[PDB]
Amino acid sequence: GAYRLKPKRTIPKKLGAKKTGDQYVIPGNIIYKQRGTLWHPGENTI
Amino acid sequence: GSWLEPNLNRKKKMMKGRPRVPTGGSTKGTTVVWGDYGLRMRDHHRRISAQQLKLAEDTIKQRLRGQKYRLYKRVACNVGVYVSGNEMRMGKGKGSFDHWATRVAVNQIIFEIRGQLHEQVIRDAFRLAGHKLPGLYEFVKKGDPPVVGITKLEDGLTVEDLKNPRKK
RNA sequence: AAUAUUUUUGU
RNA sequence: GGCUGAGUAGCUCAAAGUAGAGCAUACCGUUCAAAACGGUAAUGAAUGUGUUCGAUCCACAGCUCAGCCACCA
RNA sequence: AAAUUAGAUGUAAAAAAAAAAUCUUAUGAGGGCGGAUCCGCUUCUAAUAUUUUUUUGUAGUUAUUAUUAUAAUAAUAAUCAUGUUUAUUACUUAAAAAGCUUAAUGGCUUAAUCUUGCCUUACUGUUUGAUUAACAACAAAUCUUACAGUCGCGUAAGCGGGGCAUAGGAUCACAAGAUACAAAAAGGAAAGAUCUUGGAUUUUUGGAAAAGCUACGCUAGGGAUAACAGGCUAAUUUGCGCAAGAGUGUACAAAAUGAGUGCGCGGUUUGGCACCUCGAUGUCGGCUUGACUAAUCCUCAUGGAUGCAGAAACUAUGUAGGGUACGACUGUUCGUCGAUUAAAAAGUUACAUGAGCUGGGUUAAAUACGUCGUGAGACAGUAUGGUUUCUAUCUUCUAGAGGGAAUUAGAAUAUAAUAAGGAUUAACCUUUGUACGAAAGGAACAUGGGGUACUAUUGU
RNA sequence: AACAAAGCACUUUGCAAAAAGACGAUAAGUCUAAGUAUUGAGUGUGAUUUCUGCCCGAUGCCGGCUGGUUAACGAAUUUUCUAAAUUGAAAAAAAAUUUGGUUUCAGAGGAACCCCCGGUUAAUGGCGGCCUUAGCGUGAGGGUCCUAAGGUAGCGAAAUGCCUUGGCCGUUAAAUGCGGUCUUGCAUGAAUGAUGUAACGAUACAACAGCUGUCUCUAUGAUUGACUCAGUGAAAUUGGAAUAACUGUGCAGAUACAGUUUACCUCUAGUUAGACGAGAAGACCCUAUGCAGCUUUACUGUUACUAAUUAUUGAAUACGAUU
RNA sequence: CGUGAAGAUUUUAUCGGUGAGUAUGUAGACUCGGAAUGACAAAGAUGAAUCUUGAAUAAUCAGACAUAGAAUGAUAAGGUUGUAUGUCAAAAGGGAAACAGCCCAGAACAAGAGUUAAGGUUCCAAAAUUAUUAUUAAGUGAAAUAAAGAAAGUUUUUAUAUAAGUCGACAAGAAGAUGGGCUUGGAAGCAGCCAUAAUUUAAAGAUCUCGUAACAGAGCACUUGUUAAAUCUUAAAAGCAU
RNA sequence: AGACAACACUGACUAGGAUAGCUGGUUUUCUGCGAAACCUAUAAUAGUAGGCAAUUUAAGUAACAUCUUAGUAGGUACAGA
Ligand SMILES: [K+]
Ligand SMILES: [K+]
Ligand SMILES: [K+]
Ligand SMILES: [K+]
Ligand SMILES: [K+]
Ligand SMILES: [K+]
Ligand SMILES: [K+]
Ligand SMILES: [K+]
Ligand SMILES: [K+]
Ligand SMILES: [K+]
Ligand SMILES: [K+]
Ligand SMILES: [K+]
Ligand SMILES: [K+]
Ligand SMILES: [K+]
Ligand SMILES: [K+]
Ligand SMILES: [K+]
Ligand SMILES: [Mg+2]
Ligand SMILES: [Mg+2]
Ligand SMILES: [Mg+2]
Ligand SMILES: [Mg+2]
Ligand SMILES: [Mg+2]
Ligand SMILES: [Mg+2]
Ligand SMILES: [Mg+2]
Ligand SMILES: [Mg+2]
Ligand SMILES: [Mg+2]
Ligand SMILES: [Mg+2]
Ligand SMILES: [Mg+2]
Ligand SMILES: [Mg+2]
Ligand SMILES: [Mg+2]
Ligand SMILES: [Mg+2]
Ligand SMILES: [Mg+2]
Ligand SMILES: [Mg+2]
Ligand SMILES: [Mg+2]
Ligand SMILES: [Mg+2]
Ligand SMILES: [Mg+2]
Ligand SMILES: [Mg+2]
Ligand SMILES: [Mg+2]
Ligand SMILES: [Mg+2]
Ligand SMILES: [Mg+2]
Ligand SMILES: [Mg+2]
Ligand SMILES: [Mg+2]
Ligand SMILES: [Mg+2]
Ligand SMILES: [Mg+2]
Ligand SMILES: [Mg+2]
Ligand SMILES: [Mg+2]
Ligand SMILES: [Mg+2]
Ligand SMILES: [Mg+2]
Ligand SMILES: [Mg+2]
Ligand SMILES: [Mg+2]
Ligand SMILES: [Mg+2]
Ligand SMILES: [Mg+2]
Ligand SMILES: [Mg+2]
Ligand SMILES: [Mg+2]
Ligand SMILES: [Mg+2]
Ligand SMILES: [Mg+2]
Ligand SMILES: [Mg+2]
Ligand SMILES: [Mg+2]
Ligand SMILES: [Mg+2]
C-alpha cells in the first residue's frame, strides 16, 4: 500500500500447462488454461 | 526534453534498479564513436545524478572557454530517483521525486570532445571533470579497442579468448 | 383652509 | 512538518449544454461650472495538461494561498 | 486548425512430361523373419515433402519484321476471358489501432468482428472427467462430458445447457409457485419437509443491531511494544580532515582566502531500527569529587607571511605540565550582558557522579486562566502547590593492623638498589627607551630583584 | 487563587384539606412549619465604589387556534380452516352461498408530546470579512458580501501572548524578572461577571534598609551517637561461590568466557564506583473481544412526570354535528 | 526590395517538428534471439521403505542468521518484506583467540603414537624452524584489506639514449629588418586586441618565467665547446612498500 | 477535597456464589521415531479451526527418491535495438 492503504491480493488463477507432452489423459482432463488462444485445439481436443 | 531533464512524468515512480553488469562479453558503450577523445569510468558501476553531470559540463566549458570544440554526451538522465524523508520512519509508501539520474556501467564513456585543440589542453578538462564526478575516470583516445568487463581487448585479444575456459 | 418628495459645492 | 477548502469583468458577487446582474468606467445631455441625476454603450471564467459530443463545472500537477492538526512519555 | 465524398500492395488464371536419390508416413501388398490385424527388426510399392537437383518442352491465337514459294519457316510483342468491364476468381497487402458490455492484460481477422434471414438451448432432470486433487483446508465457485425429454437454425456435416476471456455474499427469517412426503385419537387442517424463484454497502463483504473520558483509576500480562541510557547504522549535525582550483588578494592561484564538488575519518546532534532491561536500568540542571581524549583559549619551542620593519596579530607544525576565575538574568544546559584577566576553549565517562546531596524544571492527585470538546474532560499551552527510602555481604578504594617463607637459627639498630606517588601558574621592573622605525611606537638574548640578619649589590 | 461567606440577581411556592421542595420495596405520613409571597425551596454570582452592552436565530422552559397530527376506542370493512344445510356438480370432482365455531385483515372520527404562532439572556449559549484613499505614508471618508447579532464600555505580552527575553521608560555595574506605558488580543470582556481603591493574608512574585557563618572560607569548643571493654541480643537479604585489572567477545554494558597483566594468608574502621545493589509480579507505554466510575444528540431499557380512556359511575337541559 | 500601416523573397551550419539510417546508448510494466538451473511425465537401472492407503491421533501457525538476487530505506542498519539453498532452532564434537546461524562433521560405550575432513605444524600448543623461486625493510604484515591521492622508496617488464661523448655541471653565444600594427599618460618580446608566409645564422618564439612608469637588465627555448660513463640515459606500466 | 462512613471508599466490612484466549508450575527410568514457526478462515493477529503434516502398525505398491536416454511446457540471466 501507501499513505492510503489499498489491499491488493487476488486469488491465483493458475494458468498454464496442466499436462506436458506424451502425458496420458482421459476425456475431460484440462490440458492448458489460458486467456485467449495462445494454443489452439488440435487433433482429438475441444 | 534534454539529456538532463527528459520528457518523462515525475508522478510515475521507478524502482531503484541496478546498473548493467555485462557478464556475457558485451563491449556496449566502451568506445569512442563520435569524438576524438573520451572520459571513461574505470572503477565500478554507479548511478550518476543530473547535478553531478551538469557540473562536469560546466567544468569543461570553464576550462575550454574561448576555444573551438564539440562536446558529446553519451549518457542520459532517464532514471527518476525518489527519496523519502531521512527523518521519516520506515513504511507509509514510497518516497517523492528527488532528481533525475543515469546508471553507468564500468568502462563506459561519459563525454566525448572533438576540436582543433591540443591533447594536453583536453586532458586538463577531463581531469578536472573527473575530480568532481563520482568515482574514477580515465582519458581515452579514438581507435583503441573496447573493454570487456575490466579487461581491454589489446594485443590481438578477442572476446572468444576470454570465454575460453583454458587461459593458462 | 391645516397643505408639505429630493436639490450639495464655488482657489 | 502533515491534510483540507478556495482562485471569473476595474471592483463585487452569482451560475458540464451558461458566461449573467450590480457598482465602477466611457460618450452625450441637464447646470454659469461641478457633483448628484437622466439616456445610451463597452468590460472576465487563474496555470497548464487529461476526461467528455462539448468543461466556470469532472480529473491531475504547479503558483497564489488561507484554514486546521503537530497528541502520550 | 476542425464538417462531406472519393482513393491509397502486387501477382496469377492453355499446359506440362520424365530419371534417380534422401527421409517421413500407409486401416498398402492382410509382405517376409522372430516372437492378417499386438511389437522390435525389415525389403517392395504408393503418397506428401525436400536437392540449386539431370533435364526435356514452353506452344496455340492475333499482329509485326525478315526470308522463302496467299502459304511455309524463324524471331519479336501481346494473350485469365463465349463473358452484362462496375468483369470475375485465387493468393498477397508489416506492426499498432478500431471492433468484440464496462479498468487492465491476453486473444480473435481462416472468427470470438460486422451485415442479413429465421429464431429464443439465456432449455427440464440426472450425470462424466478435470482445475498436475480450484483458492498451499472446507464451503460458496470455474471449465467440460454423456443419457433421456423437445425446440431452433442448417442442403449437409452438425451446432446450441447465454455473451472473446478474466471483477455480483451464504444461512436463517420472509414472499410467490410446484411436489403428495408426513398429519401427535380419527377425518381434515395448521405448522413442517423436498424442488424452483424473488427482495441485501449482512461493505469489519465465511455474514454482531453498538459513542466517549479517566491525571482518582484497578487487575491480569508485555522488553512479543514506546519514553531514559546502552547496542547497530552514519542520512544528518552544533565535529573535522584530504584532493582539486572557479574566484578574491592594486600585480600574483595556494601570505590569507576557497563557490559549487569529489574521497574519507569521527561517534559528540536530530533521527532510523526495536537487539538488552516493563516479577522495576530513577530523569533535566546545580553542588561534591574525579579520571581520560586532544580536533589548543592562555603559557613554552618554531616554519610561512609583494601581503614578516618593530610591536601586536593572522596562519601552520610540535606540545595536554598547569590554568581557563568573578558577578547580573533565566529552572535552565545553552545563550545574552557587566567588569577583571596571561587566558577567562571544548569534549567523553549510563548527555560521569541522587544505595554522595539538592529538587528550581519536567511528569500524579488539588485549583484557576485561555483554547479545544455537546459533555465528562483534554492540551511540546501557561500558572500557585505538592512524603526524594535503605544499619554495606562481596569486588574496587582510603587508612591501620594480626599472621607469614628467610638464602633459610633468630634478633636489635641504622639503611641501599629500586618502585609507587607528590610538587608543576603567570606577570612586571632592571636590561632600555638598546635592535627596528620618518615618527609614534617598541623587542629579543642576558643579569639582578633571599638581605632595614649574614652575604651580595646600588646610593650617600 | 479552591470551598464557604454577607450582599446581589433570576426561577419557583396562594396553603380548600398535598404550598412548592425532600424523603417514603409505597403508601399512610414526616421535615418544611404550629411557617404563609417581606414564607420556603432551587440556581448562579460573590461586600462596597464605577458598571453590567448587542443577538430569541439554535437549544431549553413558558404561554397560545372551535387548528393539523392523533395510540387506545371506533362508524365503514375484509379473510383462513372446519361442521351442518341449501345450491351446484350429479363423470373419477369439486366449487359457491348461508349459519355455528375458529382465525385474520381493516380505520371516517378521535389526546398529550410533536407541527404551527409568540415570549424569555443575572436561561444553556453566540457576539464576522474584503477592497479603496487627503502623495510616499496614515485612513477620517467612500465601496460592497454575509449574519439571529457581529465583542459595546473597560481591560490588555495579563494566573490569559505560541511567535517572544515584543518595543519603550524606571529599577540592577550587568533584568528572560518586577513596576509603568504602547498594544495588530495565536487564544481579553462584562453577574462561567468587567473594573479601580481602603482594610485584611503562615497565599504568590519583585525591590529597599538593617541583620547575620547563606557565602568569600572555614576554624575552634560542648553534649549525645559513632570507637573499645563487659551484658543482652535484631532485620531486610541470600541458587551455590576458591567473588582482581584491562581490551575484545557475547541476549548487543562481564568477578566467572578469550588473551594478557597483576596479587602472600586474614581481619578492623572508613567510604559508596559496581555487583544493570535491596525494597514494591512498572503507576508511564502497549496488549486482553479483562474491569470500575463518570459523560453524552452511543445501543437497548427502567422511572419521575405528562396525556387519553374501560372500571368504581348516575342525571338533566342544551348547543351541535353525523346523517 | 517595398507600402499610406501592409508583407514578399530570399539566406542561416539558430529553436521545435517531420522523413531516412543494418547509427550510438537506455530497460520492472521492450524481448526479434536465448541459456544453465528448476518443473512435468515415460522406460530402464540403482537404493537406506524413504511412498500411498486403512484404522488411531499430535504439535505448530513471534522464527533467526549465512550466501546469492531483488523490492523498500539512503546502493545505511544485527533494518523491513519476498525468492533459492543450508544450518541453527531441536546438534554435541574439531576449526573460526572467545562464538546458536560461518568452514568441516551428525555424539550408543571404551581401547589405538590407528586412518582422515575442515584447519594447521618456532614456543604457549598435538605436528616442518620441510624443500623451490621471487618480492618487501615498512614489524608493512603475520585469522575483521580504511579511500581518493602524492612522491628521485624499491624491484620487474616493455620502449628508448650512448665514445657520432648519452646524463649532469661548467664557459660563451642566444642576432638583424624592428620600439611589429593597434591601444595607451606610457605598451620597446613580455596590460590588452590583430597579425605572426619571411630573413640571416653554429643556432635565436613579433616571444615561456622575472624585471622597468616605459626603456634598460637577468634567465629559458635553442646552438657550439670543455669535463667525462664500456651492463651506468630518459619515460611509462605493473608488483610490494612510505 | 471523589472528603469521610473504625487495616479498605470513583462506593466499606463480612458470609455465600465466579471467570481468567493471561503468567507461573506439572514429580521415576530405559527404548524407538521425530516436527513447526507456512497456507486458508476467524470482532481475527501472543487465540482457534481446517490443511500441509509428526507418531502408532496394518494392508498395498507399475509406491517414493536419484541417475541415464528420448520428449514437453515456459522467455529469466545474458545478449540485442
Ligand atoms: K443473427
Ligand atoms: K388428526
Ligand atoms: K506552601
Ligand atoms: K632511597
Ligand atoms: K465563584
Ligand atoms: K471573582
Ligand atoms: K438569541
Ligand atoms: K427560543
Ligand atoms: K485567614
Ligand atoms: K537478556
Ligand atoms: K556502592
Ligand atoms: K602489526
Ligand atoms: K489471546
Ligand atoms: K533416540
Ligand atoms: K533419529
Ligand atoms: K522469444
Ligand atoms: Mg476496497
Ligand atoms: Mg571523482
Ligand atoms: Mg467661497
Ligand atoms: Mg458479439
Ligand atoms: Mg487444493
Ligand atoms: Mg471476513
Ligand atoms: Mg474467500
Ligand atoms: Mg489535573
Ligand atoms: Mg526488544
Ligand atoms: Mg620567517
Ligand atoms: Mg614537568
Ligand atoms: Mg548523567
Ligand atoms: Mg549511584
Ligand atoms: Mg565488610
Ligand atoms: Mg613559568
Ligand atoms: Mg641595611
Ligand atoms: Mg458586587
Ligand atoms: Mg406537598
Ligand atoms: Mg450580559
Ligand atoms: Mg421565538
Ligand atoms: Mg383496536
Ligand atoms: Mg386514523
Ligand atoms: Mg382531527
Ligand atoms: Mg474592544
Ligand atoms: Mg456571564
Ligand atoms: Mg558489645
Ligand atoms: Mg565488555
Ligand atoms: Mg571458570
Ligand atoms: Mg555512608
Ligand atoms: Mg553477576
Ligand atoms: Mg533480521
Ligand atoms: Mg524483527
Ligand atoms: Mg522455540
Ligand atoms: Mg556445533
Ligand atoms: Mg591460532
Ligand atoms: Mg600418527
Ligand atoms: Mg610441540
Ligand atoms: Mg606590440
Ligand atoms: Mg477531581
Ligand atoms: Mg480517598
Ligand atoms: Mg522451517
Ligand atoms: Mg465475525
UniProtKB/TrEMBL annotation, chain A:
Coiled coil: none annotated. It comes from the Eukaryota. It is found in: Mitochondrion. Belongs to the bacterial ribosomal protein bL27 family. This is Large ribosomal subunit protein bL27m. The lineage of its organism: Eukaryota, Fungi, Dikarya, Ascomycota, Pezizomycotina. The gene is 5E6.150. The chain holds residues 67 to 112 of 447 of the full protein.
Automatic annotation (TrEMBL), chain B:
One of its GO terms (molecular function) is rRNA binding. One of its GO terms (biological process) is mitochondrial translation. Keywords: Metal-binding, Ribonucleoprotein, Ribosomal protein. GO terms for cellular component: mitochondrial large ribosomal subunit. Mg(2+) binds at G130, L133, G135. Belongs to the universal ribosomal protein uL16 family. This is Related to ribosomal protein L16, mitochondrial. The lineage of its organism: Eukaryota, Fungi, Dikarya, Ascomycota, Pezizomycotina. The gene is B14D6.470. The chain holds residues 61 to 228 of 249 of the full protein.
